[PDB]
Amino acid sequence: DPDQICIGYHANNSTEQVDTIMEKNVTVTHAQDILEKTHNGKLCDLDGVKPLILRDCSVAGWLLGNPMCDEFLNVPEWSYIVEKINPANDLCYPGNFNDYEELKHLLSRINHFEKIQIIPKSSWSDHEASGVSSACPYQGRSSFFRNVVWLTKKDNAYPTIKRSYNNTNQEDLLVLWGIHHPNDAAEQTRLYQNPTTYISVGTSTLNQRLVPKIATRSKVNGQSGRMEFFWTILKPNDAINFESNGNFIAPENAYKIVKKGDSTIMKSELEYGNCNTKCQTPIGAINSSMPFHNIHPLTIGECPKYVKSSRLVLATGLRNSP
Amino acid sequence: DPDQICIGYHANNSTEQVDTIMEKNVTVTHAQDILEKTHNGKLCDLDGVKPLILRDCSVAGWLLGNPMCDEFLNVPEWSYIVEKINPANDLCYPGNFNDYEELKHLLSRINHFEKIQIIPKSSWSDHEASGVSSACPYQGRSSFFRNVVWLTKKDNAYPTIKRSYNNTNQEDLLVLWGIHHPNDAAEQTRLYQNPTTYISVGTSTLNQRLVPKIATRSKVNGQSGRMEFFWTILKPNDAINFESNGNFIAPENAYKIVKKGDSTIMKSELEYGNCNTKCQTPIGAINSSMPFHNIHPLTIGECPKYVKSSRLVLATGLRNSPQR
Amino acid sequence: DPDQICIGYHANNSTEQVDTIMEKNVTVTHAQDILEKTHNGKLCDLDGVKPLILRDCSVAGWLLGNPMCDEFLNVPEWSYIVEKINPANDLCYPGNFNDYEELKHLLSRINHFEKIQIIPKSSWSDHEASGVSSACPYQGRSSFFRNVVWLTKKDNAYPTIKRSYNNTNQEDLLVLWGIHHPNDAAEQTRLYQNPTTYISVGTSTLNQRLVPKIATRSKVNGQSGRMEFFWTILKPNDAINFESNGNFIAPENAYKIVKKGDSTIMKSELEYGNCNTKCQTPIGAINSSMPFHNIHPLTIGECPKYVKSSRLVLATGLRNSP
Amino acid sequence: GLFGAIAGFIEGGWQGMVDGWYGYHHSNEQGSGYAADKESTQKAIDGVTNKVNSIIDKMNTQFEAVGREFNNLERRIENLNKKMEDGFLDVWTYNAELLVLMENERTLDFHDSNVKNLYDKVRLQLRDNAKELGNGCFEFYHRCDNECMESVRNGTYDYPQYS
Amino acid sequence: GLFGAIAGFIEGGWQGMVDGWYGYHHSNEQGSGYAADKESTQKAIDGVTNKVNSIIDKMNTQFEAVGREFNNLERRIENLNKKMEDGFLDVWTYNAELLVLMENERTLDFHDSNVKNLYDKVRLQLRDNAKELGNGCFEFYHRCDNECMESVRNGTYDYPQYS
Amino acid sequence: GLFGAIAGFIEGGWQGMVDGWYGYHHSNEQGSGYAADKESTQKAIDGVTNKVNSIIDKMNTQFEAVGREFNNLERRIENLNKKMEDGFLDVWTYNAELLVLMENERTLDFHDSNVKNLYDKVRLQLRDNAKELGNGCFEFYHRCDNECMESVRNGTYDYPQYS
Ligand SMILES: CC(=O)N[C@@H]1[C@@H](O)[C@H](O[C@@H]2O[C@H](CO)[C@H](O)[C@H](O[C@]3(C(=O)O)C[C@H](O)[C@@H](NC(C)=O)[C@H]([C@H](O)[C@H](O)CO)O3)[C@H]2O)[C@@H](CO)O[C@H]1O
Ligand SMILES: CC(=O)N[C@@H]1[C@@H](O)[C@H](O[C@@H]2O[C@H](CO)[C@H](O)[C@H](O[C@]3(C(=O)O)C[C@H](O)[C@@H](NC(C)=O)[C@H]([C@H](O)[C@H](O)CO)O3)[C@H]2O)[C@@H](CO)O[C@H]1O
Ligand SMILES: CC(=O)N[C@@H]1[C@@H](O)[C@H](O[C@@H]2O[C@H](CO)[C@H](O)[C@H](O[C@]3(C(=O)O)C[C@H](O)[C@@H](NC(C)=O)[C@H]([C@H](O)[C@H](O)CO)O3)[C@H]2O)[C@@H](CO)O[C@H]1O
Ligand SMILES: *[C@@H]1O[C@H](CO)[C@@H](O)[C@H](O)[C@H]1NC(C)=O
Ligand SMILES: *[C@@H]1O[C@H](CO)[C@@H](O)[C@H](O)[C@H]1NC(C)=O
Ligand SMILES: *[C@@H]1O[C@H](CO)[C@@H](O)[C@H](O)[C@H]1NC(C)=O
Ligand SMILES: *[C@@H]1O[C@H](CO)[C@@H](O)[C@H](O)[C@H]1NC(C)=O
Ligand SMILES: *[C@@H]1O[C@H](CO)[C@@H](O)[C@H](O)[C@H]1NC(C)=O
Ligand SMILES: *[C@@H]1O[C@H](CO)[C@@H](O)[C@H](O)[C@H]1NC(C)=O
Ligand SMILES: *[C@@H]1O[C@H](CO)[C@@H](O)[C@H](O)[C@H]1NC(C)=O
Ligand SMILES: *[C@@H]1O[C@H](CO)[C@@H](O)[C@H](O)[C@H]1NC(C)=O
Ligand SMILES: *[C@@H]1O[C@H](CO)[C@@H](O)[C@H](O)[C@H]1NC(C)=O
Prior knowledge:
The complex is a heterohexamer, with 3 copies of chain A and 3 copies of chain D.
Chain A: E1 4-9, E2 16-18, E3 26-28, E4 31-33, E5 35-36, E6 43-46, E7 52-53, H1 59-64, E8 81-83, E9 95-97, H2 100-107, E10 110-117, E11 133-138, E12 141-143, E13 148-150, E14 161-166, E15 173-181, H3 185-192, E16 199-202, E17 207-210, E18 226-234, E19 239-244, E20 248-251, E21 253-260, E22 265-267, E23 272-277, E24 279-281, E25 284-285, E26 292-293, E27 300-301, E28 305-306, E29 313-315
Parallel strand pairs in A: 5-26, 6-23, 7-8, 8-22, 9-18, 26-28
Antiparallel strand pairs in A: 2-3, 4-29, 10-21, 11-12, 13-20, 14-19, 15-18, 15-20, 15-21, 16-17, 16-19, 24-25, 24-27
Chain D: E1 22-27, E2 33-36, H1 38-58, H2 75-126, E3 130-132, E4 137-140, H3 146-154, H4 159-162
Antiparallel strand pairs in D: 1-2, 3-4
Helix pairs in contact in D: 1-2
The structure holds a molecule of 3 linked components (NAG-GAL-SIA) (3 copies) and 2-acetamido-2-deoxy-beta-D-glucopyranose (9 copies).
């Protein structure tokens, strides 16, 4: 019957649970999830800029011009680059790309090349410039990389090559060339006439002199021969000078570095998703205002911070009584 | 005289102490030590698998077959490898091992080799294969590495060598070979006849052409000459092709990689402890249920987490203050 | 009114503010700043020991003896070394220094060299030893690095060089030498007579045979030729052996390593402050009792711990009521 | 919690009090009702919202993994790179998880404390004018109408008027 | 600690109560004895055990150093490797030591809080029927036999029955 | 604060008590004055000084950045180096800032707690012999001279003498 005032606290229908040091699964009136756990499974444009999806081609295959990579002869500017784990179209003619990983690292800071001619085919009057291999098929016939040229002897002679290019452009220039390592001495003279050969390359900083290596090697893509490729960055107003008396895989085209910025090379099996995002991972894009996510450690864009947590929930309300 | 009830708390004879931010050496009724601070000072088997104790031999000495390392010619499966900081028996004939550290990295993921003869010593008809050095003694006589062969001229001729080995096994094969760097031009022709030489090696991935380096060098183990060793992993069904007109230290034996798993190369001065453990460190084994330990940062097996702390003790009971 | 006693706490005129998790800008009666935010903007002696300020010279320029770096022919013991981002006096004769970064790492643990002669100029009776270049001016005239010698042919002859040096000192010895890369075959014979040359170098651990590389190169400091420099540490009682029939830039002076300890190579544009400190940064010295600072991460001496924070203030007193 | 109010002397929460986190249930002749306390609820919202923002802002400059590639003979540096990246991710995962656990505990104690403080504010205001049942309630001696209940929440409550 | 009971108003602990962490001493006509409060003791045992497990389980993804070897001309990366591994060892040593310290402090305050809460649980039951001595003891106005004492410990003490 | 004494039932601090951190303001026939409590103020200085020093000392083995140089074709390891160093710097900046933030809150709560404990130390001594105002003040029923005030402050107050 007598009057009374009570002190009490809010309860509701919430079944939200949070954790503490001393207690797990504490039911609270209000909670705030701060961990993004979902992605769209797609490779998207990053803030309106399409990525470069190399499909079945590697960065090597792209830049050198593997005949199977013609899709990528003059790509537009990209936001990020996507490469498969083991791209089928790489070095069609077997060999290797010198300092390949350091080159890929530079790519991570580049958004656009403009490919230009630096040595025209019309330059080669005293050499054969149409060398091909069945290791580089195109349309079921022997072909070769599009951006470099296989020079061989003409009229049973290989006179010494002297070639210069001055970078008159305002941009740095990525230049590529290679050396051919033959199978034996007979092959050496058959292709190049001269038994003892070299390629010397100089700039203001480069001081290179390569000599081919004959060795007996296993067939890779049908061929025991090998090509080893090299690269330099040619600064504006500097010039590159090549000299060779054989085994020279000569430049034809090189790449002006026209746009630098944030980029990355993502490894992914995913294809293009015809979508736009502000945050991309190799397994899918993220659209979230969560401060954290657990999708993948490698991201590009405006992203939540990655943690390995399966759950992150902050208590905001109070302990909710049943 | 009137009845009463009191509220209070537990006290005991405990002198256990813990620390907080605001105070140190707080006496508590109960505490829980969570730091393992002791070890057995032995090198033990890991989960019943014996380690490979290299004693006075290095990894190079073992693999190349330094005559001082005959104990390790055909070793059984190991759990981890133990090597001294400065092994006495290394490259008996002085020189170096190319990409040695990368090879040792590979070993960290290998548990067993099956060593096989790939090129018989007796199969060299046009070359001498019995080259020895006082830099590699064995029973007080000039000897040489067991797993590679020192080829020299025969009848004042060193014809061009062309040898191939096809890996017909199902396992990866570790192949070793080397080059000899002579003291001078006279020694070059005395040993190999041809003044200008090379070794070419090719696989599906390897494209090597070595040329000897003549230089005037200090005596190491009594010899001014040098041998430089190389290695590759030959995949199943791939083949290795050697060509040379001199200075070739040819493979005899190579190593089938038969068991791959978790391993490590541990640096320690200790010997085998006739003992078994779940957790091993370079200074002793750990048998503990503590969550932490401070023994040594480098461990293999099922181990507590390493910290640099001298002390970790959690308060469990309360502030111990008995009435006096 | 009968007698009374009240409980209360201190309040003052303080406007000192601290932060907590739930609250920002909390007024307290007492607070303690634990973050040092000021430096003297100078490069000082570290605990009474002057740094080596290389000014416009690089480490390479210093050690090889670029004539523009004569100030540093025999420097006294140092506490740390200061080098500019882009020192103008480096390799006066263009080229490079092999494993230069690894050499600089060694330098970080060295406080003093004593430079000694290991091969005198008088040793060269069968070769010309006065080779100079306009790329290495001294007083505006053609000159050369002080510590190595450019040997060229004498009487149209370059006989095979054989030199040994036994380290009879009790200290490790830093030994420097180089190879010259000429412009063409004609220049090779003009300087060295022999067309096919080598430099062989051996110690107890070193086994080196260098061969020159002819390439067509851009002019740097007026010269298209190149010099490539090498180094080794010669142990007490070991010996170094040189053999060459051309292109050899021979040692004259080498460096005994007489004092090892804590040092660093500091990148700074500052110069000597005529000053003394216990803690030095590339942008200025610190005189503080704070446990933390935010001046710069790269310090030497007895220093506060570096943090990126703009503000660190601990509450000591209590909440200051209005 | 540490303050013995939420699930302490006050056995449970109220479904009926929708207006705020903390408040009062009264029972008089005019009719029983639920009224949330304005200041303490608002204070708690300000404190909790700030705690959230502080936690987010402190993680603002976490580690960011970058793809680096290595060749067949750079295994040691590849392994080094991987362990370094995994290392920082583990460190920051730990930091995030631990901070949340620790602050979740503090938030619950904070609410618990706020409840007790409100109970004591009523207790010290009433003193002799009301009985203390011990279940978080105060039995009145005199019949307190709506105007009496109002003065308690405001802090206007004149003790000398009722004694 | 912060709650002012342990080394507060109850001046010291009882060696005679070997029964649990917190409890009662009664003395009436039938005799006297100690008795642990079962729920608050079991409550504290649960929280402290969980705290211990949480500290252990939070560290489980700790850094683990790996032996890596470098040659004479790989000194920069050797140093990088060393400083990196030492770097993580120091980070995790700090995390372990600091967590233990902060949680030791919370554990002691937790106990202090539990005693205070237990004292209040009794205080709110007794009210007018017993005198609050201030030393942690209450002196009964009426006679309280063993079953009466048991109901106090129970939280089933019947107030109207004795007043 | 969590204990509701600082900016709680005691409305504000005293400008006039420039003596210590926590104290008394007595009034009797002989006059009025401010006197600080020695035990609690000294306890506060010791705990706070120990806190400051522990925080400094736990940071003692912080990461230290070392300048490393790399050439034009070591860009990957250069970048690895930079990220590792910035990584540790960020980890230790976070550790430092977070520790200060967390301990600042605990410090202010620590002060609040001491005032609260000091209030209870007096209340449990006086009991029925004095009225509790709720202001942070106790009104004496009997006369308390300067020597009597000394007994309250020292803790030597005698209850059966006045009851
Ligand atoms: C079973 C058998 O022995 N059949 C031989 C068969 O090998 C031979 O094929 C040619 O063999 C040579 C090596 O000896 C090359 O492999 C040839 O392939 C090509 C290639 O496609 O790459 C042909 C190509 O036109 C050549 N291009 C140029 C510019 O020279 C290249 C090139 O020489 C090599 O790649 C250099 O390493 O080689 C392959 O056709 C056939 C036909 O001659 O004869 C059988 O008796
Ligand atoms: C002071 C002096 O001149 N004393 C010579 C003394 O040098 C010489 O001994 C021979 O010296 C040569 C170097 O010129 C080698 O050091 C010889 O050592 C061996 C070795 O044991 O390693 C002998 C061995 O049988 C050789 N093995 C093979 C397969 O050739 C090797 C090998 O040639 C070299 O190591 C290659 O670098 O060398 C050592 O006997 C003696 C005898 O001639 O005469 C003194 O006057
Ligand atoms: C347009 C034109 O042809 N003008 C020539 C001009 O080239 C030439 O200058 C000489 O050119 C040579 C290269 O062919 C060198 O660059 C000469 O410079 C020096 C130098 O300063 O380095 C001179 C020095 O005395 C030489 N020192 C030694 C030890 O040999 C060096 C050295 O040969 C090179 O550096 C090695 O690479 O070269 C430079 O004088 C002049 C004079 O012939 O005539 C113009 O008409
Ligand atoms: C919980 O309550 C809210 C409103 O208070 C209501 O909208 C919702 O349907 C309820 N949820 C459940 C699962 O009953
Ligand atoms: C509650 O916590 C336990 C671990 O204590 C967990 O296994 C469970 O999945 C959690 N949530 C449930 C059952 O909804
Ligand atoms: C390239 O051309 C520019 C302008 O014609 C010239 O000034 C420069 O010296 C040239 N660079 C080289 C390396 O010859
Ligand atoms: C404390 O008591 C135990 C008996 O339970 C005894 O073993 C121990 O030695 C005692 N510690 C002393 C006396 O210091
Ligand atoms: C307790 O701590 C002090 C310093 O805080 C130290 O000197 C002492 O060795 C510690 N332990 C003892 C006395 O057992
Ligand atoms: C090695 O032998 C197998 C089986 O005879 C053969 O198929 C394979 O081509 C050989 N490999 C090489 C690289 O020659
Ligand atoms: C602030 O207070 C101090 C005493 O603590 C006094 O000395 C000083 O004059 C005051 N400052 C101002 C500006 O009033
Ligand atoms: C108080 O905090 C604000 C914003 O949080 C900040 O801008 C300012 O520096 C602080 N102090 C002031 C305004 O005196
Ligand atoms: C250098 O000289 C010392 C003393 O004369 C001698 O013992 C040593 O063998 C020499 N070192 C070499 C590599 O010949």
